[PDB]
Design a protein around this ligand. Structure first.
Ligand SMILES: Nc1ccn([C@H]2C[C@H](O)[C@@H](CO)O2)c(=O)n1
Ligand SMILES: Nc1ccn([C@H]2C[C@H](O)[C@@H](CO)O2)c(=O)n1
Ligand SMILES: *[C@@H]1O[C@H](CO)[C@@H](O)[C@H](O)[C@H]1NC(C)=O
Ligand SMILES: *[C@@H]1O[C@H](CO)[C@@H](O)[C@H](O)[C@H]1NC(C)=O
Ligand SMILES: [Zn+2]
Ligand SMILES: [Zn+2]
Ligand SMILES: [Zn+2]
Length: 267
């Protein structure tokens, strides 16, 4: 996701974590504002463009070698690669937070988890084709961009009605209400099925597989000729919106569940 998506995911998580989980995170982050998760939700992106953080670029995605839009699937051994991926990074950073929650590595590990649980839920972060759709040129409301970018940024910003942190907070609260009492309330019990703090690979693979199904159903089902030749702010947007909204909601809810687990380990 772009900044709006990541900040939305983070504000949703802040709405669902336990009070002790909140304190646990605020201490690690050295940020006790009411935007504590949202303030750091883009850090991993910032960091990957620095000298020290270049190595972490591959941690934002898993390049699933599947066959969309006819068939989708993610396979950890097949797809992660020797440079690491979203799934191997969730393992590494979760385990840092379990083994050394007070240590010097906990700050970055937490910021990585917050960002990467978000990124896993963006379907094109679970797809090899043309570098997660970066290589696919599109027109969006008259602007030339690419397919990955519209999923990350153009479409969520359009749906949220902006890009600022305060817009993110309002979008988060909309989606949060959908979870508590609205259209997602009968789905959310299934959203933490299979979650296991002792098996970050399996757990994050559930989420990656889930987002990946949308590559076939939604992202690419019109086919590449349609996508090359049509302005995607029309019908493509209209059918994309409910999918990215639900996936952002899931990302937030799952991030909160995972943070609760990490924060509750005895010591
Ligand atoms: N194989 C790839 C390559 C890049 N990206 C993401 C991370 C990059 O910062 C962004 C570029 O728009 O897309 C992706 O998800 N999959
Ligand atoms: N994430 C972003 C960043 C910028 N802009 C647009 C609106 C801003 O006014 C302009 C900045 O030059 O670009 C946008 O819509 N989304
Ligand atoms: C785990 O995280 C640390 C700190 O960013 C990094 O040095 C290391 O290479 C990572 N290990 C794996 C296996 O991803
Ligand atoms: C997109 O259009 C360009 C130029 O019209 C052409 O080179 C290319 O083959 C097209 N790609 C697809 C998948 O239609
Ligand atoms: Zn992102
Ligand atoms: Zn992206
Ligand atoms: Zn990222």
């Amino acid at each position: 996701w772009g900044n709006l998506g990541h900040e939305t995911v983070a504000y949703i998580a802040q709405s669902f974590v336990a009070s002790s989980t909140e304190s646990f995170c605020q201490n690690i982050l050295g940020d006790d504002s009411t935007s504590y998760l949202a303030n750091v939700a883009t850090w991993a992106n910032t960091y990957k463009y620095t000298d020290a953080g270049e190595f972490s670029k591959p941690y934002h995605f898993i390049d699933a070698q599947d066959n969309p839009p006819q068939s989708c699937g993610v396979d950890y051994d097949r797809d992660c690669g020797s440079a690491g991926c979203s799934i191997s990074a969730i393992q590494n950073y979760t385990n840092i937070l379990l083994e050394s929650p007070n240590g010097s590595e906990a700050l970055n590990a937490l910021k990585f988890v917050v960002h990467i649980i978000g990124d896993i839920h963006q379907p094109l972060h679970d797809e090899n084709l043309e570098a997660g759709g970066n290589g696919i040129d599109v027109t969006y409301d008259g602007e030339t961009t690419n397919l990955h970018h519209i999923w990350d940024t153009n479409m969520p910003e359009e749906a949220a009605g902006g890009y600022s942190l305060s817009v993110a907070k309002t979008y988060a609260d909309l989606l949060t209400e959908r979870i508590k009492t609205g259209t997602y309330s009968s789905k959310k019990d299934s959203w933490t099925d299979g979650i296991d703090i002792k098996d970050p690979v399996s757990t994050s693979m559930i989420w990656a597989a889930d987002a990946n199904t949308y590559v076939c159903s939604t992202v690419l089902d019109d086919g590449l000729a349609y996508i090359n030749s049509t302005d995607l702010s029309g019908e493509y947007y209209d059918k994309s919106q409910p999918v990215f909204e639900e996936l952002i909601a899931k990302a937030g809810y799952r991030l909160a569940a995972w943070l609760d687990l990490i924060a509750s380990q005895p010591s």
